[PDB]
Every structure is written in structure tokens, then in C-alpha cells.
């Protein structure tokens, strides 16, 4: 509930209080599962396609006469039983995406963040690199000071181009703005590191 | 996701062709013919696992009849007399005794004859 803010190359400076109505919600497993499934479904392209017997090239006329040959009745050379013919119930371009209610989405995100906070995986920092120029070496040293786990979600403001670039290509580190937080990314991360102003903005956007 | 069928499809084919070894002609070489032969074979084995229980009783009764008539008594009256005497040995072991220990079988026949009623038509 009470998180202490850490500084790069140094120690604590302040503290932040997490409101319990945003970080102490119970964990609805089924709700989060549905929300995450909807997210991943909307992430698809669905650009698969096939050709039906009406779209395969040629094959318009009846290949030979109906009777008197001793062969099966055929009707077209692009019928699905033919090699090179059409596809029956083949894939067509689709749009996988679901209309999950906003209340369910927000509740799932709140539950995930509450689980993280309850296990103690929420960290708060002032900023990543004390300079104005990016430096992956020092940013990685600072993150390793905070954390010894693989997947880390770094939430920083959209105006911190000096600090986003620093941790941009660190493996296992994911960056997103406070207004783009989502259940999938929170649940994939092991620790969530907030910048102080990013955390305050997220808290203010929910009161 | 397009799926090629071969890897899954051959699993049943191998088992059919492996169980169909020893059949002559297409019935051991071709999967479609071996499948029909396997249907017939497993039905036959089911039928025979229940028929042999009567088959062996038939054989035992034949041998018991031979041994009893050798000892001058019908299988008919030997069975009646053994039940009257209260001997509860079954036909498998009666036939086994008749093959192995004829003296013991003669003793059993004496017991059955003794327990049999004096006039068997009353």
C-alpha cells in the first residue's frame, strides 16, 4: 500500500500511497481469462484465404457428356474432389475481435495490478537515466538493482524519450504508457516498474 | 492451419497389418481386406471363447463315459450315484482321474454304485 520511490544511482527520496480501490481488488481468474483471450483474439490479422470452385481458374464447361462413357458424372474440372480444384469450407479472411464490456476490462486490469501489488512486485522510480541522453548500460544496471527476474513491465510517461530509448532493446523488458495498461502485459510481467509521474497519472485517471 | 493426414492415419493401419500376419493372400497384405478379416476374426474369437466351455465339457463327458462303461456302469447312473453319494468333484477332474489313476476311478465308481438306489425304475 505504501511504496517508496527509488532514484537511479542512489536511494529513496519519497513515497507513494496506492489507493486500495485500485490495488487491493480480489483476483477474478475467469474474468481475467476472458479479457486476456479477447485481447489475444483482437491481436490476430486473420489474413488467410482460399479459393472456392467458383474462383478457381477455368473449369466452366462440363468436361464430357453425362451418359454413355462408363465414367463418373463430373460437371466441372474444378469440383472439390479434383486435384487442383476448389476448397470446401476453406479459410476466408476473418476479423477476430470481441466486444468485452468496459467494466469487465477495467475490473480485470485492476485485479491483475492488485495481485502484483499484493505480492510486492510494484516498484516506483523517479526516472531511469539521470542524464538527458539514453544509456542502456546504466539503465540495465538500475533495473538489475531493482529486480532479478526476467519479464519486467516498465510504465513511463509518453514524454520520456530519454528513458524509453535506454531500456528499449533490453530483452525481457516491455514499455507502455500509463494510459495503455492492459491485463495481458501486466500478467506477463514479473515486476511492474512505474515512474513516479506515470503512477500518479494512472491513479488520477481513476480517482 | 492446414493438416497433412499421414502421420495420424498410419497408426491404425500399422496395427491392423501387424495383427493380420499369417493370413494368406490379400488378407495379410492389403489394409482394406485385413480390416474385414479382423472383424471376422475377433467375432470368431469372441464366439469361441464361450463355445469352448461347452466343448471341453463335451470331451470330459465322453471320456468319463468311456471309463465308466469300462468299469461296467453308464455315465448316466454314475452321475446320478455320485450326486446321491454327495461327491462334489467336477467333470474336468473326473476325466483327469480316469486318464491318470484308474484305481481311484474304480473306487469312485464303487462309491457311486453303492449310493445308487436299489431299483432305478421306481
Amino acid at each position: 500500500l505504501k511504496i517508496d520511490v527509488k532514484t537511479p544511482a542512489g536511494k529513496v527520496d519519497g513515497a507513494i500511497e496506492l489507493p486500495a480501490e485500485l490495488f487491493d481488488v480480489p483476483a477474478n481468474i475467469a474474468l481475467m481469462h476472458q479479457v486476456v483471450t479477447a485481447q489475444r483474439a483482437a491481436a490476430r490479422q486473420g489474413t488467410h484465404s482460399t479459393k472456392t470452385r467458383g474462383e478457381v481458374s477455368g473449369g466452366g464447361r462440363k468436361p464430357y457428356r453425362q451418359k454413355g462413357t462408363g465414367r463418373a458424372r463430373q460437371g466441372s474440372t474444378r469440383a472439390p474432389q479434383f486435384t487442383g480444384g476448389g476448397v470446401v469450407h476453406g479459410p476466408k479472411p476473418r476479423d477476430y475481435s470481441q466486444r468485452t464490456p468496459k467494466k469487465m476490462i477495467a475490473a480485470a486490469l485492476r485485479g491483475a495490478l492488485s495481485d502484483r501489488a499484493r505480492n510486492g512486485r510494484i516498484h516506483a522510480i523517479t526516472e531511469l537515466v539521470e542524464g538527458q541522453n539514453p544509456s542502456t548500460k546504466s539503465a540495465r544496471a538500475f533495473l538489475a538493482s531493482l529486480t532479478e527476474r526476467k519479464q519486467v513491465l516498465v510504465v513511463i510517461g509518453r514524454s520520456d524519450e530519454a528513458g524509453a530509448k535506454s531500456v528499449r532493446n533490453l530483452p525481457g523488458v516491455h514499455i507502455l504508457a500509463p494510459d495503455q495498461l492492459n491485463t495481458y502485459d501486466v500478467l506477463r510481467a514479473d515486476d511492474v516498474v512505474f515512474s513516479v509521474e506515470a503512477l500518479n497519472a494512472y491513479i488520477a485517471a481513476n480517482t | 492451419a492446414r493438416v497433412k493426414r499421414a502421420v495420424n492415419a498410419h497408426k491404425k493401419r500399422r496395427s491392423i497389418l501387424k495383427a493380420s500376419r499369417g493370413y494368406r493372400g490379400q488378407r495379410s497384405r492389403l489394409y482394406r481386406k485385413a480390416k474385414e478379416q479382423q472383424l471376422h476374426s475377433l467375432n470368431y474369437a469372441y464366439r469361441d471363447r464361450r463355445a469352448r466351455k461347452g466343448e471341453f465339457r463335451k470331451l470330459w463327458i465322453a471320456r468319463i463315459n468311456a471309463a465308466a462303461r469300462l468299469n461296467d456302469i453308464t455315465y448316466n447312473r454314475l452321475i446320478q450315484g455320485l450326486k446321491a453319494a454327495g461327491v462334489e468333484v467336477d467333470r474336468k477332474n473326473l476325466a483327469d482321474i480316469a486318464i491318470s489313476d484308474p484305481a481311484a476311478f474304480t473306487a469312485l465308481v464303487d462309491v457311486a454304485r453303492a449310493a445308487l438306489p436299489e431299483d432305478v425304475n421306481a
Binding site: 481468474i29 475467469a30 481475467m32 481469462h33 491483475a112 495481485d115 505480492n119 495481458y184 500478467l187 | -
Partner: protein
Amino acid sequence: LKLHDLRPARGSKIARTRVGRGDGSKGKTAGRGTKGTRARKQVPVTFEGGQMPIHMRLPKLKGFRNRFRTEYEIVNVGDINRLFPQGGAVGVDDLVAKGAVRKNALVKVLGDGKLTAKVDVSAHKFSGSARAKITAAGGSATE
């Protein structure tokens, strides 16, 4: 935590039935059975085999429909009493704010329930019983 820990609620998702996949399931006719129409096509709901159907041998319902009819959203004095225990003024905006009535519609007050609170209801087209109940309670009913 840990995406490999999310599972759906029991009974929420059940596998679809695949209908042309061998004898141990819906085998070859796929539940159709027949040799007739229903083995290849659907029969329209309106078809009855050739006798006059139910939707054609019955007379049309009598009357017309008024193109010019006015509709009122209704609220009862019992609901008013439940929603405004302290009494006071009761307007159409107050009613829509409390959710007792749809918005942007003409409101008519009906007289079902018990009214005890002194209220000042402004609406359209009061009922006969509603006026009596409101004035017995001690308020007023303006239009």
C-alpha cells in the same frame, strides 16, 4: 499472476460437435436419417404440405393503428414515495436522474401504491387516482 494460471470457469466452454466423423459419433447421415427433402435441404417454416397454412386461414386482426398516437412514460406514486422519502419538489428531470423514467419523453403519473411523503410533482397528464393521492398526502400536482 502468470498467464499460465488462467483457466475458464467450469461449464463456460464446451467443445463443438463434429458431425460427419465416423460411426462412434454422429456417423454418416449426421443426424438426418431420411431420404426425402430433409436429407438435403431445409423445409420453410411457412410450408404445411399444401393445406392452407395457419398464417393464411385465420382472419386478420381487426382495426387500424393510429399514426398520430402520443405515448407517455409512466411513473407510479408508490415509486415516487419510494424514491423521494424526504418529499420536496419532484420534476421530470429529477425522475430521469433517479432513473424512474426514460429521458426525453412525456411523463404521466399513475396512482398505484401508497404515497405518504409531501411532494410537489410537476408532469404531464396526471391520473385520476394520482391527483387524489397526492392531494391527500398534502402536496400539489401541476402540469
